[PDB]
mmCIF file with all atom_site columns, N, CA, C and O in Angstrom:
data_model
loop_
_atom_site.group_PDB
_atom_site.id
_atom_site.type_symbol
_atom_site.label_atom_id
_atom_site.label_alt_id
_atom_site.label_comp_id
_atom_site.label_asym_id
_atom_site.label_entity_id
_atom_site.label_seq_id
_atom_site.pdbx_PDB_ins_code
_atom_site.Cartn_x
_atom_site.Cartn_y
_atom_site.Cartn_z
_atom_site.occupancy
_atom_site.B_iso_or_equiv
_atom_site.pdbx_formal_charge
_atom_site.auth_seq_id
_atom_site.auth_comp_id
_atom_site.auth_asym_id
_atom_site.auth_atom_id
_atom_site.pdbx_PDB_model_num
ATOM 1   N N  . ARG A 1 1  ? 1.523  -2.116  -4.447  1.00 16.45 ? 1  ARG A N  1
ATOM 2   C CA . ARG A 1 1  ? 2.393  -3.292  -4.820  1.00 16.45 ? 1  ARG A CA 1
ATOM 3   C C  . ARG A 1 1  ? 3.886  -2.866  -4.725  1.00 16.45 ? 1  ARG A C  1
ATOM 4   O O  . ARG A 1 1  ? 4.287  -1.708  -5.155  1.00 16.45 ? 1  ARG A O  1
ATOM 5   N N  . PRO A 1 2  ? 4.559  -3.723  -3.889  1.00 14.08 ? 2  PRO A N  1
ATOM 6   C CA . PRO A 1 2  ? 5.994  -3.451  -3.633  1.00 14.08 ? 2  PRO A CA 1
ATOM 7   C C  . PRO A 1 2  ? 6.844  -3.422  -4.839  1.00 14.08 ? 2  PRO A C  1
ATOM 8   O O  . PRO A 1 2  ? 6.517  -4.217  -5.857  1.00 14.08 ? 2  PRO A O  1
ATOM 9   N N  . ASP A 1 3  ? 7.839  -2.748  -4.879  1.00 14.56 ? 3  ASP A N  1
ATOM 10  C CA . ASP A 1 3  ? 8.722  -2.670  -6.138  1.00 14.56 ? 3  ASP A CA 1
ATOM 11  C C  . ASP A 1 3  ? 9.369  -4.040  -6.433  1.00 14.56 ? 3  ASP A C  1
ATOM 12  O O  . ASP A 1 3  ? 9.654  -4.289  -7.588  1.00 14.56 ? 3  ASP A O  1
ATOM 13  N N  . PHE A 1 4  ? 9.490  -4.938  -5.453  1.00 13.45 ? 4  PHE A N  1
ATOM 14  C CA . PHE A 1 4  ? 10.080 -6.115  -5.749  1.00 13.45 ? 4  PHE A CA 1
ATOM 15  C C  . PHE A 1 4  ? 9.189  -7.006  -6.624  1.00 13.45 ? 4  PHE A C  1
ATOM 16  O O  . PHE A 1 4  ? 9.795  -7.998  -7.340  1.00 13.45 ? 4  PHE A O  1
ATOM 17  N N  . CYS A 1 5  ? 8.021  -6.710  -6.780  1.00 11.81 ? 5  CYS A N  1
ATOM 18  C CA . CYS A 1 5  ? 7.170  -7.307  -7.691  1.00 11.81 ? 5  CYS A CA 1
ATOM 19  C C  . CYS A 1 5  ? 7.549  -7.293  -9.234  1.00 11.81 ? 5  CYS A C  1
ATOM 20  O O  . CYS A 1 5  ? 7.072  -7.999  -10.075 1.00 11.81 ? 5  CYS A O  1
ATOM 21  N N  . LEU A 1 6  ? 8.192  -6.107  -9.560  1.00 11.76 ? 6  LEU A N  1
ATOM 22  C CA . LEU A 1 6  ? 8.667  -5.908  -10.909 1.00 11.76 ? 6  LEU A CA 1
ATOM 23  C C  . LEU A 1 6  ? 10.110 -6.379  -11.144 1.00 11.76 ? 6  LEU A C  1
ATOM 24  O O  . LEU A 1 6  ? 10.533 -6.339  -12.293 1.00 11.76 ? 6  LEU A O  1
ATOM 25  N N  . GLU A 1 7  ? 10.699 -6.996  -10.248 1.00 15.62 ? 7  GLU A N  1
ATOM 26  C CA . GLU A 1 7  ? 12.012 -7.630  -10.533 1.00 15.62 ? 7  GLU A CA 1
ATOM 27  C C  . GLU A 1 7  ? 11.795 -8.984  -11.043 1.00 15.62 ? 7  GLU A C  1
ATOM 28  O O  . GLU A 1 7  ? 10.808 -9.731  -11.025 1.00 15.62 ? 7  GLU A O  1
ATOM 29  N N  . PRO A 1 8  ? 12.878 -9.374  -12.091 1.00 17.35 ? 8  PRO A N  1
ATOM 30  C CA . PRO A 1 8  ? 12.652 -10.720 -12.685 1.00 17.35 ? 8  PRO A CA 1
ATOM 31  C C  . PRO A 1 8  ? 12.937 -11.774 -11.578 1.00 17.35 ? 8  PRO A C  1
ATOM 32  O O  . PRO A 1 8  ? 13.573 -11.487 -10.527 1.00 17.35 ? 8  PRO A O  1
ATOM 33  N N  . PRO A 1 9  ? 12.518 -12.982 -11.946 1.00 15.60 ? 9  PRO A N  1
ATOM 34  C CA . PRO A 1 9  ? 12.698 -14.075 -10.978 1.00 15.60 ? 9  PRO A CA 1
ATOM 35  C C  . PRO A 1 9  ? 14.097 -14.504 -10.798 1.00 15.60 ? 9  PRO A C  1
ATOM 36  O O  . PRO A 1 9  ? 14.821 -14.240 -11.779 1.00 15.60 ? 9  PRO A O  1
ATOM 37  N N  . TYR A 1 10 ? 14.521 -15.102 -9.891  1.00 17.40 ? 10 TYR A N  1
ATOM 38  C CA . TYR A 1 10 ? 15.975 -15.515 -9.563  1.00 17.40 ? 10 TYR A CA 1
ATOM 39  C C  . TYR A 1 10 ? 16.104 -16.903 -9.185  1.00 17.40 ? 10 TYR A C  1
ATOM 40  O O  . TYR A 1 10 ? 15.554 -17.355 -8.132  1.00 17.40 ? 10 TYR A O  1
ATOM 41  N N  . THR A 1 11 ? 16.721 -17.836 -10.044 1.00 19.99 ? 11 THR A N  1
ATOM 42  C CA . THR A 1 11 ? 16.860 -19.149 -9.728  1.00 19.99 ? 11 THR A CA 1
ATOM 43  C C  . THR A 1 11 ? 17.791 -19.473 -8.680  1.00 19.99 ? 11 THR A C  1
ATOM 44  O O  . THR A 1 11 ? 17.641 -20.397 -7.793  1.00 19.99 ? 11 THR A O  1
ATOM 45  N N  . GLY A 1 12 ? 18.896 -18.725 -8.592  1.00 19.26 ? 12 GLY A N  1
ATOM 46  C CA . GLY A 1 12 ? 20.024 -18.923 -7.460  1.00 19.26 ? 12 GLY A CA 1
ATOM 47  C C  . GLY A 1 12 ? 20.941 -20.125 -7.786  1.00 19.26 ? 12 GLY A C  1
ATOM 48  O O  . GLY A 1 12 ? 20.766 -20.727 -9.011  1.00 19.26 ? 12 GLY A O  1
ATOM 49  N N  . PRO A 1 13 ? 21.877 -20.270 -7.062  1.00 17.92 ? 13 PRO A N  1
ATOM 50  C CA . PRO A 1 13 ? 23.008 -21.285 -7.282  1.00 17.92 ? 13 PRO A CA 1
ATOM 51  C C  . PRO A 1 13 ? 22.606 -22.697 -6.823  1.00 17.92 ? 13 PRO A C  1
ATOM 52  O O  . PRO A 1 13 ? 23.559 -23.646 -7.207  1.00 17.92 ? 13 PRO A O  1
ATOM 53  N N  . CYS A 1 14 ? 21.553 -23.150 -6.134  1.00 19.39 ? 14 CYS A N  1
ATOM 54  C CA . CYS A 1 14 ? 21.291 -24.359 -5.770  1.00 19.39 ? 14 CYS A CA 1
ATOM 55  C C  . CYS A 1 14 ? 20.690 -25.256 -6.822  1.00 19.39 ? 14 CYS A C  1
ATOM 56  O O  . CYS A 1 14 ? 20.343 -24.718 -7.903  1.00 19.39 ? 14 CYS A O  1
ATOM 57  N N  . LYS A 1 15 ? 20.816 -26.483 -6.594  1.00 19.59 ? 15 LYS A N  1
ATOM 58  C CA . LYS A 1 15 ? 20.579 -27.459 -7.755  1.00 19.59 ? 15 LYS A CA 1
ATOM 59  C C  . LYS A 1 15 ? 19.105 -28.047 -7.825  1.00 19.59 ? 15 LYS A C  1
ATOM 60  O O  . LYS A 1 15 ? 19.016 -28.989 -8.673  1.00 19.59 ? 15 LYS A O  1
ATOM 61  N N  . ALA A 1 16 ? 18.218 -27.834 -6.855  1.00 19.86 ? 16 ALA A N  1
ATOM 62  C CA . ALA A 1 16 ? 16.784 -28.391 -6.999  1.00 19.86 ? 16 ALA A CA 1
ATOM 63  C C  . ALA A 1 16 ? 15.989 -27.784 -8.133  1.00 19.86 ? 16 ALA A C  1
ATOM 64  O O  . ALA A 1 16 ? 16.502 -26.945 -8.661  1.00 19.86 ? 16 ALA A O  1
ATOM 65  N N  . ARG A 1 17 ? 14.958 -28.478 -8.388  1.00 21.24 ? 17 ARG A N  1
ATOM 66  C CA . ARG A 1 17 ? 14.048 -27.901 -9.419  1.00 21.24 ? 17 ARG A CA 1
ATOM 67  C C  . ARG A 1 17 ? 12.668 -27.747 -8.747  1.00 21.24 ? 17 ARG A C  1
ATOM 68  O O  . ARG A 1 17 ? 11.644 -28.496 -8.966  1.00 21.24 ? 17 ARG A O  1
ATOM 69  N N  . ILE A 1 18 ? 12.515 -26.698 -7.954  1.00 19.80 ? 18 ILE A N  1
ATOM 70  C CA . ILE A 1 18 ? 11.251 -26.373 -7.326  1.00 19.80 ? 18 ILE A CA 1
ATOM 71  C C  . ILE A 1 18 ? 10.501 -25.319 -8.065  1.00 19.80 ? 18 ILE A C  1
ATOM 72  O O  . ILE A 1 18 ? 11.117 -24.266 -8.414  1.00 19.80 ? 18 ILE A O  1
ATOM 73  N N  . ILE A 1 19 ? 9.280  -25.601 -8.374  1.00 17.81 ? 19 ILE A N  1
ATOM 74  C CA . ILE A 1 19 ? 8.302  -24.725 -9.171  1.00 17.81 ? 19 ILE A CA 1
ATOM 75  C C  . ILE A 1 19 ? 7.828  -23.634 -8.011  1.00 17.81 ? 19 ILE A C  1
ATOM 76  O O  . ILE A 1 19 ? 7.189  -23.852 -7.149  1.00 17.81 ? 19 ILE A O  1
ATOM 77  N N  . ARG A 1 20 ? 8.122  -22.350 -8.404  1.00 17.20 ? 20 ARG A N  1
ATOM 78  C CA . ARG A 1 20 ? 7.755  -21.309 -7.613  1.00 17.20 ? 20 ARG A CA 1
ATOM 79  C C  . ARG A 1 20 ? 6.989  -20.254 -8.442  1.00 17.20 ? 20 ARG A C  1
ATOM 80  O O  . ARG A 1 20 ? 7.094  -20.471 -9.698  1.00 17.20 ? 20 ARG A O  1
ATOM 81  N N  . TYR A 1 21 ? 6.287  -19.223 -7.784  1.00 15.21 ? 21 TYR A N  1
ATOM 82  C CA . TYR A 1 21 ? 5.530  -18.430 -8.563  1.00 15.21 ? 21 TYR A CA 1
ATOM 83  C C  . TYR A 1 21 ? 6.283  -16.951 -8.429  1.00 15.21 ? 21 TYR A C  1
ATOM 84  O O  . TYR A 1 21 ? 6.833  -16.638 -7.401  1.00 15.21 ? 21 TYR A O  1
ATOM 85  N N  . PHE A 1 22 ? 5.996  -16.214 -9.567  1.00 14.18 ? 22 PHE A N  1
ATOM 86  C CA . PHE A 1 22 ? 6.591  -14.748 -9.504  1.00 14.18 ? 22 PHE A CA 1
ATOM 87  C C  . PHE A 1 22 ? 5.589  -13.954 -10.307 1.00 14.18 ? 22 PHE A C  1
ATOM 88  O O  . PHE A 1 22 ? 4.849  -14.479 -11.241 1.00 14.18 ? 22 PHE A O  1
ATOM 89  N N  . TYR A 1 23 ? 5.489  -12.744 -9.858  1.00 15.54 ? 23 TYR A N  1
ATOM 90  C CA . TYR A 1 23 ? 4.656  -11.776 -10.532 1.00 15.54 ? 23 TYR A CA 1
ATOM 91  C C  . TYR A 1 23 ? 5.255  -11.350 -11.877 1.00 15.54 ? 23 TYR A C  1
ATOM 92  O O  . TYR A 1 23 ? 6.447  -10.713 -11.898 1.00 15.54 ? 23 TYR A O  1
ATOM 93  N N  . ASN A 1 24 ? 4.538  -11.494 -13.026 1.00 15.78 ? 24 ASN A N  1
ATOM 94  C CA . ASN A 1 24 ? 5.086  -10.992 -14.300 1.00 15.78 ? 24 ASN A CA 1
ATOM 95  C C  . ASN A 1 24 ? 4.458  -9.728  -14.734 1.00 15.78 ? 24 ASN A C  1
ATOM 96  O O  . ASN A 1 24 ? 3.200  -9.955  -15.042 1.00 15.78 ? 24 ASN A O  1
ATOM 97  N N  . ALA A 1 25 ? 4.896  -8.566  -14.646 1.00 19.87 ? 25 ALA A N  1
ATOM 98  C CA . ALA A 1 25 ? 4.155  -7.233  -14.773 1.00 19.87 ? 25 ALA A CA 1
ATOM 99  C C  . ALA A 1 25 ? 3.622  -7.165  -16.145 1.00 19.87 ? 25 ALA A C  1
ATOM 100 O O  . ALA A 1 25 ? 2.556  -6.434  -16.324 1.00 19.87 ? 25 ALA A O  1
ATOM 101 N N  . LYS A 1 26 ? 4.339  -7.770  -17.079 1.00 21.33 ? 26 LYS A N  1
ATOM 102 C CA . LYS A 1 26 ? 3.855  -7.564  -18.530 1.00 21.33 ? 26 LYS A CA 1
ATOM 103 C C  . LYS A 1 26 ? 2.587  -8.286  -18.750 1.00 21.33 ? 26 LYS A C  1
ATOM 104 O O  . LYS A 1 26 ? 1.561  -7.803  -19.200 1.00 21.33 ? 26 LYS A O  1
ATOM 105 N N  . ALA A 1 27 ? 2.445  -9.544  -18.077 1.00 19.14 ? 27 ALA A N  1
ATOM 106 C CA . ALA A 1 27 ? 1.209  -10.337 -18.314 1.00 19.14 ? 27 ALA A CA 1
ATOM 107 C C  . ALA A 1 27 ? 0.158  -9.878  -17.337 1.00 19.14 ? 27 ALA A C  1
ATOM 108 O O  . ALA A 1 27 ? -1.007 -10.235 -17.598 1.00 19.14 ? 27 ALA A O  1
ATOM 109 N N  . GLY A 1 28 ? 0.515  -9.343  -16.219 1.00 18.08 ? 28 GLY A N  1
ATOM 110 C CA . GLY A 1 28 ? -0.473 -8.962  -15.252 1.00 18.08 ? 28 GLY A CA 1
ATOM 111 C C  . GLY A 1 28 ? -1.015 -10.079 -14.369 1.00 18.08 ? 28 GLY A C  1
ATOM 112 O O  . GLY A 1 28 ? -2.021 -9.963  -13.748 1.00 18.08 ? 28 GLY A O  1
ATOM 113 N N  . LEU A 1 29 ? -0.165 -11.163 -14.324 1.00 17.92 ? 29 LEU A N  1
ATOM 114 C CA . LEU A 1 29 ? -0.477 -12.386 -13.400 1.00 17.92 ? 29 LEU A CA 1
ATOM 115 C C  . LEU A 1 29 ? 0.840  -12.980 -13.102 1.00 17.92 ? 29 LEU A C  1
ATOM 116 O O  . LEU A 1 29 ? 1.794  -12.821 -13.572 1.00 17.92 ? 29 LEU A O  1
ATOM 117 N N  . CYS A 1 30 ? 0.686  -13.898 -12.118 1.00 21.28 ? 30 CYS A N  1
ATOM 118 C CA . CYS A 1 30 ? 1.663  -14.722 -11.539 1.00 21.28 ? 30 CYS A CA 1
ATOM 119 C C  . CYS A 1 30 ? 1.931  -15.966 -12.508 1.00 21.28 ? 30 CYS A C  1
ATOM 120 O O  . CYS A 1 30 ? 0.969  -16.680 -12.760 1.00 21.28 ? 30 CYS A O  1
ATOM 121 N N  . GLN A 1 31 ? 3.181  -16.233 -12.798 1.00 18.90 ? 31 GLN A N  1
ATOM 122 C CA . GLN A 1 31 ? 3.564  -17.320 -13.659 1.00 18.90 ? 31 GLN A CA 1
ATOM 123 C C  . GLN A 1 31 ? 4.674  -18.330 -12.790 1.00 18.90 ? 31 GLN A C  1
ATOM 124 O O  . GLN A 1 31 ? 5.061  -17.849 -11.748 1.00 18.90 ? 31 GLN A O  1
ATOM 125 N N  . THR A 1 32 ? 4.940  -19.463 -13.248 1.00 17.71 ? 32 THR A N  1
ATOM 126 C CA . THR A 1 32 ? 6.016  -20.160 -12.537 1.00 17.71 ? 32 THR A CA 1
ATOM 127 C C  . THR A 1 32 ? 7.294  -20.009 -13.249 1.00 17.71 ? 32 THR A C  1
ATOM 128 O O  . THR A 1 32 ? 7.579  -19.589 -14.397 1.00 17.71 ? 32 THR A O  1
ATOM 129 N N  . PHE A 1 33 ? 8.358  -20.329 -12.380 1.00 15.27 ? 33 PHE A N  1
ATOM 130 C CA . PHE A 1 33 ? 9.647  -20.469 -12.821 1.00 15.27 ? 33 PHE A CA 1
ATOM 131 C C  . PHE A 1 33 ? 10.457 -21.558 -11.871 1.00 15.27 ? 33 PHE A C  1
ATOM 132 O O  . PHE A 1 33 ? 9.705  -22.008 -10.998 1.00 15.27 ? 33 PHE A O  1
ATOM 133 N N  . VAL A 1 34 ? 11.589 -21.928 -12.311 1.00 12.18 ? 34 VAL A N  1
ATOM 134 C CA . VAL A 1 34 ? 12.308 -22.949 -11.521 1.00 12.18 ? 34 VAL A CA 1
ATOM 135 C C  . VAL A 1 34 ? 13.196 -22.304 -10.571 1.00 12.18 ? 34 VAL A C  1
ATOM 136 O O  . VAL A 1 34 ? 14.151 -21.522 -10.897 1.00 12.18 ? 34 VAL A O  1
ATOM 137 N N  . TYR A 1 35 ? 13.061 -22.635 -9.242  1.00 13.29 ? 35 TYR A N  1
ATOM 138 C CA . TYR A 1 35 ? 13.934 -22.136 -8.089  1.00 13.29 ? 35 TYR A CA 1
ATOM 139 C C  . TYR A 1 35 ? 14.832 -23.036 -7.689  1.00 13.29 ? 35 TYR A C  1
ATOM 140 O O  . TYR A 1 35 ? 14.360 -24.273 -7.641  1.00 13.29 ? 35 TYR A O  1
ATOM 141 N N  . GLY A 1 36 ? 16.112 -22.856 -7.617  1.00 12.45 ? 36 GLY A N  1
ATOM 142 C CA . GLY A 1 36 ? 17.107 -23.862 -7.148  1.00 12.45 ? 36 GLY A CA 1
ATOM 143 C C  . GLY A 1 36 ? 17.202 -24.330 -5.747  1.00 12.45 ? 36 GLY A C  1
ATOM 144 O O  . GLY A 1 36 ? 17.949 -25.381 -5.391  1.00 12.45 ? 36 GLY A O  1
ATOM 145 N N  . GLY A 1 37 ? 16.576 -23.709 -4.708  1.00 11.25 ? 37 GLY A N  1
ATOM 146 C CA . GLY A 1 37 ? 16.392 -24.109 -3.349  1.00 11.25 ? 37 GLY A CA 1
ATOM 147 C C  . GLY A 1 37 ? 17.179 -23.245 -2.473  1.00 11.25 ? 37 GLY A C  1
ATOM 148 O O  . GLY A 1 37 ? 17.047 -23.526 -1.166  1.00 11.25 ? 37 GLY A O  1
ATOM 149 N N  . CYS A 1 38 ? 17.878 -22.262 -2.939  1.00 11.59 ? 38 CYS A N  1
ATOM 150 C CA . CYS A 1 38 ? 18.470 -21.406 -1.912  1.00 11.59 ? 38 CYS A CA 1
ATOM 151 C C  . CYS A 1 38 ? 18.670 -20.024 -2.489  1.00 11.59 ? 38 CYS A C  1
ATOM 152 O O  . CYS A 1 38 ? 18.679 -19.792 -3.676  1.00 11.59 ? 38 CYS A O  1
ATOM 153 N N  . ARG A 1 39 ? 18.900 -18.985 -1.423  1.00 10.22 ? 39 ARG A N  1
ATOM 154 C CA . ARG A 1 39 ? 19.267 -17.638 -1.824  1.00 10.22 ? 39 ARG A CA 1
ATOM 155 C C  . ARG A 1 39 ? 18.184 -16.920 -2.578  1.00 10.22 ? 39 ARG A C  1
ATOM 156 O O  . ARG A 1 39 ? 18.456 -16.119 -3.485  1.00 10.22 ? 39 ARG A O  1
ATOM 157 N N  . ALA A 1 40 ? 16.861 -17.270 -2.162  1.00 10.43 ? 40 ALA A N  1
ATOM 158 C CA . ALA A 1 40 ? 15.711 -16.568 -2.895  1.00 10.43 ? 40 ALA A CA 1
ATOM 159 C C  . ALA A 1 40 ? 15.790 -15.022 -2.810  1.00 10.43 ? 40 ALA A C  1
ATOM 160 O O  . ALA A 1 40 ? 16.130 -14.452 -1.809  1.00 10.43 ? 40 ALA A O  1
ATOM 161 N N  . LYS A 1 41 ? 15.135 -14.433 -3.681  1.00 8.43  ? 41 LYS A N  1
ATOM 162 C CA . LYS A 1 41 ? 14.705 -12.865 -3.690  1.00 8.43  ? 41 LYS A CA 1
ATOM 163 C C  . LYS A 1 41 ? 13.322 -12.953 -3.504  1.00 8.43  ? 41 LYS A C  1
ATOM 164 O O  . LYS A 1 41 ? 12.678 -14.016 -3.235  1.00 8.43  ? 41 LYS A O  1
ATOM 165 N N  . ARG A 1 42 ? 12.768 -11.739 -3.225  1.00 8.96  ? 42 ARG A N  1
ATOM 166 C CA . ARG A 1 42 ? 11.426 -11.467 -2.831  1.00 8.96  ? 42 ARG A CA 1
ATOM 167 C C  . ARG A 1 42 ? 10.195 -11.825 -3.847  1.00 8.96  ? 42 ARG A C  1
ATOM 168 O O  . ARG A 1 42 ? 9.246  -12.174 -3.272  1.00 8.96  ? 42 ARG A O  1
ATOM 169 N N  . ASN A 1 43 ? 10.464 -11.778 -5.100  1.00 11.06 ? 43 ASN A N  1
ATOM 170 C CA . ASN A 1 43 ? 9.397  -12.082 -6.043  1.00 11.06 ? 43 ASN A CA 1
ATOM 171 C C  . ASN A 1 43 ? 9.508  -13.641 -6.244  1.00 11.06 ? 43 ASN A C  1
ATOM 172 O O  . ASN A 1 43 ? 9.975  -14.161 -7.373  1.00 11.06 ? 43 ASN A O  1
ATOM 173 N N  . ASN A 1 44 ? 9.111  -14.366 -5.304  1.00 12.62 ? 44 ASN A N  1
ATOM 174 C CA . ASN A 1 44 ? 9.191  -15.960 -5.061  1.00 12.62 ? 44 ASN A CA 1
ATOM 175 C C  . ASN A 1 44 ? 8.270  -16.223 -4.122  1.00 12.62 ? 44 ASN A C  1
ATOM 176 O O  . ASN A 1 44 ? 8.313  -16.056 -2.976  1.00 12.62 ? 44 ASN A O  1
ATOM 177 N N  . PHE A 1 45 ? 7.128  -17.022 -4.667  1.00 14.44 ? 45 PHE A N  1
ATOM 178 C CA . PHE A 1 45 ? 5.893  -17.384 -3.702  1.00 14.44 ? 45 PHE A CA 1
ATOM 179 C C  . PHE A 1 45 ? 5.744  -18.825 -3.986  1.00 14.44 ? 45 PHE A C  1
ATOM 180 O O  . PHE A 1 45 ? 5.950  -19.464 -4.997  1.00 14.44 ? 45 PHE A O  1
ATOM 181 N N  . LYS A 1 46 ? 5.277  -19.413 -2.911  1.00 12.09 ? 46 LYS A N  1
ATOM 182 C CA . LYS A 1 46 ? 4.892  -20.800 -2.868  1.00 12.09 ? 46 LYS A CA 1
ATOM 183 C C  . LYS A 1 46 ? 3.554  -21.067 -3.601  1.00 12.09 ? 46 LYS A C  1
ATOM 184 O O  . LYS A 1 46 ? 3.416  -22.256 -3.816  1.00 12.09 ? 46 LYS A O  1
ATOM 185 N N  . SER A 1 47 ? 2.720  -20.116 -3.750  1.00 12.72 ? 47 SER A N  1
ATOM 186 C CA . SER A 1 47 ? 1.467  -20.422 -4.657  1.00 12.72 ? 47 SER A CA 1
ATOM 187 C C  . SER A 1 47 ? 1.114  -19.334 -5.328  1.00 12.72 ? 47 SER A C  1
ATOM 188 O O  . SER A 1 47 ? 1.594  -18.130 -5.051  1.00 12.72 ? 47 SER A O  1
ATOM 189 N N  . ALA A 1 48 ? 0.222  -19.435 -6.349  1.00 12.20 ? 48 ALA A N  1
ATOM 190 C CA . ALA A 1 48 ? -0.177 -18.309 -7.189  1.00 12.20 ? 48 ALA A CA 1
ATOM 191 C C  . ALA A 1 48 ? -1.014 -17.241 -6.398  1.00 12.20 ? 48 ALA A C  1
ATOM 192 O O  . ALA A 1 48 ? -0.948 -16.034 -6.441  1.00 12.20 ? 48 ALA A O  1
ATOM 193 N N  . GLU A 1 49 ? -1.832 -17.796 -5.340  1.00 6.59  ? 49 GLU A N  1
ATOM 194 C CA . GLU A 1 49 ? -2.617 -16.871 -4.489  1.00 6.59  ? 49 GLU A CA 1
ATOM 195 C C  . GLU A 1 49 ? -1.826 -16.027 -3.721  1.00 6.59  ? 49 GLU A C  1
ATOM 196 O O  . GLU A 1 49 ? -2.090 -14.929 -3.590  1.00 6.59  ? 49 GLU A O  1
ATOM 197 N N  . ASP A 1 50 ? -0.740 -16.481 -3.010  1.00 5.63  ? 50 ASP A N  1
ATOM 198 C CA . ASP A 1 50 ? 0.173  -15.654 -2.218  1.00 5.63  ? 50 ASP A CA 1
ATOM 199 C C  . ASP A 1 50 ? 0.762  -14.607 -3.174  1.00 5.63  ? 50 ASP A C  1
ATOM 200 O O  . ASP A 1 50 ? 0.863  -13.288 -2.595  1.00 5.63  ? 50 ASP A O  1
ATOM 201 N N  . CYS A 1 51 ? 1.105  -14.989 -4.305  1.00 4.49  ? 51 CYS A N  1
ATOM 202 C CA . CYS A 1 51 ? 1.862  -14.010 -5.273  1.00 4.49  ? 51 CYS A CA 1
ATOM 203 C C  . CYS A 1 51 ? 0.849  -12.993 -5.679  1.00 4.49  ? 51 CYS A C  1
ATOM 204 O O  . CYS A 1 51 ? 1.089  -11.805 -5.565  1.00 4.49  ? 51 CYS A O  1
ATOM 205 N N  . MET A 1 52 ? -0.406 -13.388 -6.071  1.00 3.46  ? 52 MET A N  1
ATOM 206 C CA . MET A 1 52 ? -1.566 -12.405 -6.389  1.00 3.46  ? 52 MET A CA 1
ATOM 207 C C  . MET A 1 52 ? -1.923 -11.533 -5.414  1.00 3.46  ? 52 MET A C  1
ATOM 208 O O  . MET A 1 52 ? -2.260 -10.457 -5.583  1.00 3.46  ? 52 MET A O  1
ATOM 209 N N  . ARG A 1 53 ? -2.086 -12.089 -4.017  1.00 2.00  ? 53 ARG A N  1
ATOM 210 C CA . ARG A 1 53 ? -2.608 -11.322 -3.023  1.00 2.00  ? 53 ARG A CA 1
ATOM 211 C C  . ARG A 1 53 ? -1.404 -10.186 -2.681  1.00 2.00  ? 53 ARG A C  1
ATOM 212 O O  . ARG A 1 53 ? -1.760 -9.193  -2.272  1.00 2.00  ? 53 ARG A O  1
ATOM 213 N N  . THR A 1 54 ? -0.124 -10.406 -3.040  1.00 2.00  ? 54 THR A N  1
ATOM 214 C CA . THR A 1 54 ? 1.046  -9.439  -2.671  1.00 2.00  ? 54 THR A CA 1
ATOM 215 C C  . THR A 1 54 ? 1.239  -8.466  -3.857  1.00 2.00  ? 54 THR A C  1
ATOM 216 O O  . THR A 1 54 ? 1.295  -7.301  -3.536  1.00 2.00  ? 54 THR A O  1
ATOM 217 N N  . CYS A 1 55 ? 1.309  -9.021  -4.958  1.00 2.00  ? 55 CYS A N  1
ATOM 218 C CA . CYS A 1 55 ? 1.802  -8.465  -6.152  1.00 2.00  ? 55 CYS A CA 1
ATOM 219 C C  . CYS A 1 55 ? 0.713  -7.943  -7.166  1.00 2.00  ? 55 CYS A C  1
ATOM 220 O O  . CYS A 1 55 ? 0.894  -7.175  -8.209  1.00 2.00  ? 55 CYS A O  1
ATOM 221 N N  . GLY A 1 56 ? -0.491 -8.579  -7.082  1.00 2.00  ? 56 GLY A N  1
ATOM 222 C CA . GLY A 1 56 ? -1.743 -8.434  -7.962  1.00 2.00  ? 56 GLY A CA 1
ATOM 223 C C  . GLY A 1 56 ? -2.326 -7.017  -7.929  1.00 2.00  ? 56 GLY A C  1
ATOM 224 O O  . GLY A 1 56 ? -2.135 -6.261  -6.939  1.00 2.00  ? 56 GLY A O  1
#
């Protein structure tokens, strides 16, 4: 599992309210967060599956 999986999610400076998935190492699962639409970091996935297949 890549190190980026342990970083907190990043909303960024844009103003949309896009639900994205991030790996929460404490819970051991992917959860959602609000992504602003630009400048994403790596712990940002379009589905729980993509998130779990990478960081799970």
